């Protein structure tokens, strides 16, 4: 059954490269169309030119982990292609490989930063249900995406959401295993345990990142916006409370607990400052943004929440994008 299963034997000549669409985990992301089928695909470079250890191990992680994961809410690697190996001597071939993904219509980053899309409560339900179903699927397989960002959240015009990169993804083990990179998530979405120096962290790091995304869909603005780790920890304390042994018994274990102390010992004001959020969603946000990762809810528990338990995946409900009347805004409808 070679066909479709045989990878690495196809050349990049079958794809015409349109251009760059954005920057991914390891390389820049490209757009292309297959000559035979006419399908738009997303490509990723391998760049095996560095003869230090040959094929990159971070790429080997993404090939092994993504080929095991199959879900409606995860971008699946379609195939892997290489450059033309024209010499008969496989020793002269220094060509790179390309990862072929499925192309989606838009990404949450481009949609929100431009300000065109608006999310109703039912749209957020469709977004979070697919997002947590995929995250629970990967968490059940003991994997950590470690880079939850709006740029790695892709959406098609039907209303289906999919996760993208997984280049920084590693395996999780209850046994300490390997100490990991303390900073791994974008500072605006970085968990409080990661700021304080936790090197062996739990899968709750992605739950915290998605929690910052849930509130960002209701406010149309990122929750915590800071340029430094101390300033980021301060903004988290102004909302969720300062990390203290009272609400976080193992906070003492973190190295930077005495080093990175907040300005004050703030009280939790999450429900107060998010009073405009429905109670069903506010209850979900409070659990996802819990300081202690052992007290923070899991991906499965979010699907058993009053906000997402009864959401049906048959109703895709795509986010409504304004159309035609947007061509000229601030007209007709004034006051």
């Amino acid at each position: 059954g070679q066909t479709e299963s045989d990878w690495g034997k196809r050349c990049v000549d079958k794809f015409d490269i349109i251009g760059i669409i954005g920057e991914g985990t390891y390389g820049q992301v490209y757009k292309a169309k297959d000559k035979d089928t006419g399908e738009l695909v997303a490509l990723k470079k391998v760049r095996l030119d560095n003869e230090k250890e040959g094929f990159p191990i971070t790429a080997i992680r993404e090939i092994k982990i993504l080929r095991q994961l199959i879900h409606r809410s995860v971008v699946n690697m379609k195939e892997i292609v290489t450059d033309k190996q024209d010499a008969l001597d496989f020793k002269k071939d220094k060509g790179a490989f390309y990862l072929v993904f499925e192309y989606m219509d838009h990404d949450l980053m481009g949609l929100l930063e431009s300000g065109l899309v608006h999310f109703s409560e039912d749209h957020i339900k469709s977004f979070m249900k697919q997002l947590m179903e995929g995250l629970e699927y990967c968490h059940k397989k003991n994997f950590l995406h470690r880079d939850i960002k709006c740029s790695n959240i892709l959406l098609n015009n039907s209303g289906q959401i999919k996760l993208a990169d997984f280049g920084l993804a590693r395996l999780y083990n209850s046994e300490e295993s390997r100490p990991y990179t303390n900073k791994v998530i974008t500072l605006w979405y970085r968990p409080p345990e990661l700021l304080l120096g936790e090197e062996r962290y739990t899968p709750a790091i992605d739950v915290w990142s998605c929690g910052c995304i849930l509130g960002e869909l209701f406010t149309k603005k990122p929750i915590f916006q800071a340029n430094l780790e101390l300033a980021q920890l301060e903004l988290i304390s102004r909302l969720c409370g300062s990390p203290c042994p009272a609400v976080w018994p193992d906070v003492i274990k973190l190295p930077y607990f005495n080093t990175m102390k907040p300005k004050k010992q703030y009280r939790r004001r999450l429900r107060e400052e998010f009073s405009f959020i429905p109670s069903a969603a506010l209850d979900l946000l409070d659990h996802m943004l819990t300081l202690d990762p052992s007290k923070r809810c899991t991906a499965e528990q979010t699907l058993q929440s009053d906000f997402l338990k009864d959401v049906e995946l048959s109703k895709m409900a795509p986010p409504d994008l304004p159309h035609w009347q947007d061509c000229h805004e601030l007209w007709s409808k004034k006051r």
Partner: peptide, 20 residues
């Protein structure tokens, strides 16, 4: 070293990148 690093390309292609 080079005879081994070179063979990695053919190995990945032969095993069809089915690493697991």
């Amino acid at each position: 070293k080079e005879e081994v690093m070179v063979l990695e390309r053919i190995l990945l292609q032969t095993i069809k990148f089915d690493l697991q």
